[PDB]
Design a binder for this molecule. Structure first.
Ligand SMILES: Nc1nc2c(ncn2[C@@H]2O[C@H](COP(=O)(O)OP(=O)(O)O)[C@@H](O)[C@H]2O)c(=O)[nH]1
Ligand SMILES: [Mg+2]
Length: 314
């Protein structure tokens, strides 16, 4: 059969690894019991880092607890975080986290997550902590999809679909991904560029002067117009449409694009962002780039979108 080398490109946290997990669920055979048990430590670490970030932001943003009794809980939490074996979640810690999560001050801070770059799965895990710490708990595929682990190795995802043999690789532009650049850009059949729609109101951890969507736009410009990819199929995934639909109700898109004069609705603000990316294609009138609004954690959405990508490839 024909071999298809497909690259998933995009800024950190855009959704590359999530699409890779979806390929395993959709085109391979999901996760076995033992593979799900693997994710418990990762999920606990993810959960602890999420609450610690919200707690530190209480100080940074100067928000006070709805209940002063929480201040001691926060202190004990920080202390335990330095004491527990990494990846564990003892009863005392989970009890403290649940009390903090319920606090109105903590919730006011959670609502201001954009201001401190909180990972998107924070609310997912934290609002369902009791299920995660029940003796007998086995991560569901959605739990696994929502997780984030630091993978230093090169992971090739191979699967057959529509009589094509896919060899898929997820690659970032950050320096730690350099070993992948030695060969990842050779003989690429298709590039799926992923950009988080919800990145529009966020700045970088280091450069508070640099907007994340602008960084993604900058990378797309570099890739899209590179001579290596003049005839490569390129598809744009405007990811995190679910987070975006909520964000759009509170932060105006003009925060990112001063020229934006629209009503800030999911559809119009979404199309405006799509245009900002697609207009960068200087090969546009010659080489067309399709785009899809995606929710990488939604298996049905990813299944449909990847099917369209495959028909494009064919
Ligand atoms: N709500 C929501 N979360 C998402 C979506 N796509 C990815 N995530 C989560 O966002 C985080 C960053 O995604 P990840 O795939 O690790 O990004 P990467 O650095 O590009 O590989 C993970 O915790 C994902 O579960 C999405 O469409 N919606
Ligand atoms: Mg990743």
């Amino acid at each position: 059969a024909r071999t298809v080398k497909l690259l998933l490109l995009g800024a950190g946290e855009s959704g590359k690894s999530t699409i890779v997990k979806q390929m395993k669920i959709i085109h391979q055979d999901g996760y076995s019991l033992e593979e799900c048990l693997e994710f418990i430590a990762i999920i606990y670490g993810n959960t602890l880092q999420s609450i610690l970030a919200i707690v530190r932001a209480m100080t940074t943003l100067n928000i006070q607890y709805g209940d002063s009794a929480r201040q001691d809980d926060a202190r004990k939490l920080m202390h335990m975080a330095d004491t527990i074996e990494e990846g564990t979640m003892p009863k005392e810690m989970s009890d403290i986290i649940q009390r903090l999560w319920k606090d109105s001050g903590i919730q006011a801070c959670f609502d201001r997550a954009s201001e401190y770059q909180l990972n998107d799965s924070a609310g997912y895990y934290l609002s369902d902590l009791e299920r995660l710490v029940t003796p007998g708990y086995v991560p569901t595929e959605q739990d696994v999809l929502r997780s984030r682990v630091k993978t230093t190795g090169i992971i090739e995802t191979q699967f057959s679909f529509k009589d094509l043999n896919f060899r898929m690789f997820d690659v970032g532009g950050q320096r730690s991904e350099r070993k992948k650049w030695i060969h990842c850009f050779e003989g690429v059949t298709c590039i799926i560029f992923i950009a988080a729609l919800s990145a529009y109101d966020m700045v970088l951890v280091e450069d508070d002067e640099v907007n994340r969507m602008h960084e993604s736009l900058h990378l797309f410009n570099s890739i899209c117009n590179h001579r290596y990819f003049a005839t490569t199929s390129i598809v744009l995934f405007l990811n995190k449409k679910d987070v975006f639909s909520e964000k759009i109700k509170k932060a105006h898109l003009s925060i990112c694009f001063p020229d934006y004069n629209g009503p800030n609705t999911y559809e119009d603000a979404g199309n405006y962002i799509k245009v900002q990316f697609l207009e960068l294609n200087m090969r546009r009138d010659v080489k067309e780039i399709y785009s899809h609004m995606t929710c990488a954690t939604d298996t049905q959405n990813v299944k449909f979108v990847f099917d369209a990508v495959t028909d494009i490839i064919i």
